[PDB]
Structure formats: C-alpha cells, structure tokens
Design a protein around this ligand. Sequence first.
Ligand SMILES: c1ccc2[nH]c(-c3cc[nH]n3)nc2c1
Length: 251
Amino acid sequence: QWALEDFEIGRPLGKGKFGNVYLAREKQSKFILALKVLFKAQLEKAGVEHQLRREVEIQSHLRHPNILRLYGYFHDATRVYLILEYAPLGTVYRELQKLSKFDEQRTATYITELANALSYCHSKRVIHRDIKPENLLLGSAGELKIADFGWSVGTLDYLPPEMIEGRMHDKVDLWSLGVLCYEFLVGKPPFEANTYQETYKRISRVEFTFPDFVTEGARDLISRLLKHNPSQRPMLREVLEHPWITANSSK
Ligand SMILES: c1ccc2[nH]c(-c3cc[nH]n3)nc2c1
C-alpha cells in the first residue's frame, strides 16, 4: 500500500542491531507515527526473517490501548519499513534510569495495564516472552504500551525457569510480570548477575531477595509470581484482584 515517499522522516528515536526507529509524518494525512527501519541484509543474514513476519502478523491483528499499534509495513531495496504507532513519553527503560526506582502506585498501575494487556493476548492465544522495560512504551496519558512482538508465539533476565532449562512452556508471561514488578520497585531485576552462566543458575534456583524498603504486599505478589512451578503462578485475574495492586493501582 505504502511507500517511503509517503513519509517525511524526522528525529531519530531508537537504535538496535537491525537498524533504527525514526519519528515520521505521513505526507497527505499529516499523521504522526514511528518508522522502524530494518535492513533486509541483516534480517536474512541473522536468520530472523520468519520472526519479522510473525511480528507483522500478530501485532497487526491486535488491538488494545496497551499494545503498540502496528499500522502496517513495506519494503524496498536495502530494507523493510514498519509503520508503527508513536509513543510520546518514550520507554519505561528510560524513565527507570531517569528515576532509578518507581513507587508502589506507579508500579501497580503499570502492572495492571500490563496484566490487562496480556489478558487480551492470552485470550487470543498469543504470548510475548520478551517483556522487558526496553520494550514498554509510554503513551501521552503516561500509559503503558507493550511494543515489539518478535519473540511472540539473549538477556535471560526476563525468562522463566522452564524456558531457560528448555522445556514445555505455556504462564511464562506471569513470571515476567513478577520480574518486571520487582524491577520497578528495586531498580534492577531480581535475577541480575554479571554473567550469562550465573544468571542461569540464579534463575534456575529462583534465588532472589528483597531490600528492606519493599513492602510486604509487594513481596507477597512477587513471591507468588516467581514460583518455579508454572502451575502455581496466579492467573492474571488474581493479579488484578491482588490487595496491594488494587490498594495502589491509581488506574
Ligand atoms: C524517546 C521518546 C519518545 C519515543 N517514542 C518512541 C517510539 C518507538 C516506537 N514508537 N514510538 N521511542 C521514543 C524514545
């Protein structure tokens, strides 16, 4: 449908191995969006093309306030272009370095927004797996928007024991939500190591601890989420229904 000459590219927004995302405006519509620029070269090279066209599938057909819209795509010679919704307030990653830590009411809200987001996804039998702050965008309202659906069906920090030990995986996303929740509160993930190999162990053995300032209800919720056994992990409903969530989730 589209072409590059339909757009006026703007300030660069992001980097990464495959290329960059830029601000851009659609010529005749004046519409503002984001253009992901991926090199055909590197997509083939790094044997991923299949992943790319799966991201295209899933993230297109999806619709939800807490999921980055994907309006479509197009390619040329050197590259493929993903026409993405644009998110004014950037990544959660950035707001985390900037603040280093989050409060309970910000954390809780994010957790909700995230829960609901994944509710909709699970309902459509799609799982993310790559839910890390580098992947969470903020809308104008300051609201969470899950981007990026490459790995939707490397940094182990976000990956649950089953995935990591290479097993039957169905609940993963709830482990991550646990992880995410801990990261928001403490300022780094609960499984952070210095090496790939150590992290693996730390995760495999579910070794994590709570700095003093982490309130009891938070621990509870996180603890419940970070169970080694997939089956023992709450359902999103319970997470939404948790007393520390509801107590705190401004939204
Ligand atoms: C900083 C500030 C705003 C941003 N929006 C985006 C973005 C990426 C895809 N859609 N919107 N990245 C940003 C980085």
